[PDB]
Design a protein around this ligand. Structure first.
Ligand SMILES: COc1cc(Cc2cnc(N)nc2N)cc(OC)c1OC
Ligand SMILES: COc1cc(Cc2cnc(N)nc2N)cc(OC)c1OC
Length: 186
């Protein structure tokens, strides 16, 4: 199995959702970046795995569920089988990463992308090991009810650039944003 990553878009007041919807108007090119990063696999004959909580799965419009060309795993203790359209279910992030060693996935999965929600990001960000965070900074405040956890800059280093990631300021629908990549190894 390859690298462990989180990917998120976040407003200036740390918002990542409002009642299960985007806090901001849809940004087409920002979503195209999410699809490219999460879908593109370095290794022949493997796909990347996306891991998400239950409320993040059901936030996705039905037409975009499952994320095509990626293996889709949902975290839940209440569900007893994967939701309609999903491929795998685990009770926790720790269990999911353990599954990734088992015979039905060990040779199938390249990179692992954690796509939400807040408590799933917090557990991944606070566990030891090598982890990257791909953070889109949406450069204004938007009303939110769910937030990204604190990034401890002691341990996460902001990289000076990264291949396939634009380093300058972007703008769609009058909203400025920029892409960043953070790396820890502890
Ligand atoms: C959980 O699935 C998706 C989540 C998002 C939100 C999102 C949007 N942008 C970035 N950089 N990260 C994110 N996590 C965007 C997506 O597609 C554009 C998803 O596929 C359906
Ligand atoms: C999956 O890509 C997403 C797109 C949108 C806005 C949106 C965009 N297009 C359509 N057809 N329906 C929508 N609700 C909203 C989303 O979440 C609320 C998405 O998932 C993160």
């Amino acid at each position: 199995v390859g690298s462990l990553n989180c990917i998120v878009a976040v407003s200036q007041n740390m918002g990542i959702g409002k009642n299960g919807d985007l806090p901001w108007p849809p940004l087409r090119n920002e979503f195209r970046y999410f699809k490219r990063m999460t879908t593109t696999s370095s290794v022949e004959g493997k796909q990347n795995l996306v891991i998400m909580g239950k409320k993040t799965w059901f936030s996705i419009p039905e037409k975009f569920r499952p994320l095509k060309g990626r293996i889709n795993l949902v975290l839940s203790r209440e569900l007893k089988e994967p939701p309609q359209g999903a491929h795998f279910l685990s009770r926790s992030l720790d269990d999911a990463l353990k599954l990734t060693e088992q015979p039905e996935l060990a040779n199938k999965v390249d990179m692992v992308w954690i796509v939400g929600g807040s408590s799933v990001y917090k557990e991944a960000m606070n566990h030891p090991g090598h982890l990257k965070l791909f953070v889109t900074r949406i450069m204004q405040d938007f009303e939110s009810d769910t937030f990204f956890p604190e990034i401890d800059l002691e341990k996460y280093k902001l990289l000076p650039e990264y291949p396939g990631v634009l380093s300058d300021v972007q703008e769609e629908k009058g909203i400025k944003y920029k892409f960043e990549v953070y790396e820890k190894n502890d």
